[PDB]
Amino acid sequence: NPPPPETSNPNKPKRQTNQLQYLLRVVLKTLWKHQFAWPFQQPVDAVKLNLPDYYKIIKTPMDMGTIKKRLENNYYWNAQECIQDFNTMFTNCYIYNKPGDDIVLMAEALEKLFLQKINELPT
Ligand SMILES: CCc1nnc2ccc(N[C@H](CO)Cc3c[nH]c4ccccc34)nn12
Ligand code: NA
């Protein structure tokens, strides 16, 4: 396993915005409770899960546990930055697997719910 993505970085400029608060309170917390959220709630542990090539293939890992901690720690500058992390997480699943896999069906359902939730954001 490589080290997980950082959730603090003291030199990085941080912001709190209404959209970032919404991404935590509404978007993240809704997706977290979905019946398909559990594979995505923590960094992939390639040793535990017996995926020895996971990090041979996935070079920008991301997961909702990391995203949640980034939001809680005010790590982001803007909502787009956090949205990019969600997109990376979904894309990584599609890259490491293939169409029709159970894990891909999960990611697809979560991605559709995510898009539904970010279709309209606060101002
Ligand atoms: C983000 C996690 C992730 N990304 N690519 C993958 C590829 C395999 C994988 N194995 C899961 C580890 O818990 C267990 C599992 C085996 N078949 C499944 C079908 C649906 C849901 C889980 C599984 N996890 N994985
Ligand atoms: Na919304």
Which method was used?
A: X-ray
Return the CATH number at 46.
1.20.920.10
Instruction: Please indicate, yes or no, if residue 6 is contained in any of the structural domains.
Output: no
Instruction: Please indicate, yes or no, if residue 10 is contained in any of the structural domains.
Output: no
Report CA-CA distances (Å) from 62 to 27, 66, 83.
16, 7, 12
Burial of 18 (0-12, 13-18, 19+ CB in 10 A): exposed
Q: Which of 5, 32, 19 is nearest to 82 (CA)?
A: 19
Instruction: Please indicate, yes or no, if residue 9 is contained in any of the structural domains.
Output: no
Instruction: Please indicate, yes or no, if residue 13 is contained in any of the structural domains.
Output: no
Resolution of this deposited model, Å:
1.4
Which residue's alpha carbon is nearest to atom 21 within ligand 1? 103
Q: Which residues line ligand 1 (CB under 6 A)?
A: 39-40, 44, 49, 51, 93, 96-97, 102-103, 106
Instruction: Please indicate, yes or no, if residue 106 is contained in any of the structural domains.
Output: yes
Residue 60, classed as helix, strand or coil, is coil
Give the containing element (helix H, strand E) for 104: helix 102-118
Residue 111: give the domain boundaries.
18-119
Report how far residue 51's alpha carbon sits from residue 87's, in angstroms, rounded to the nearest whole number.
21
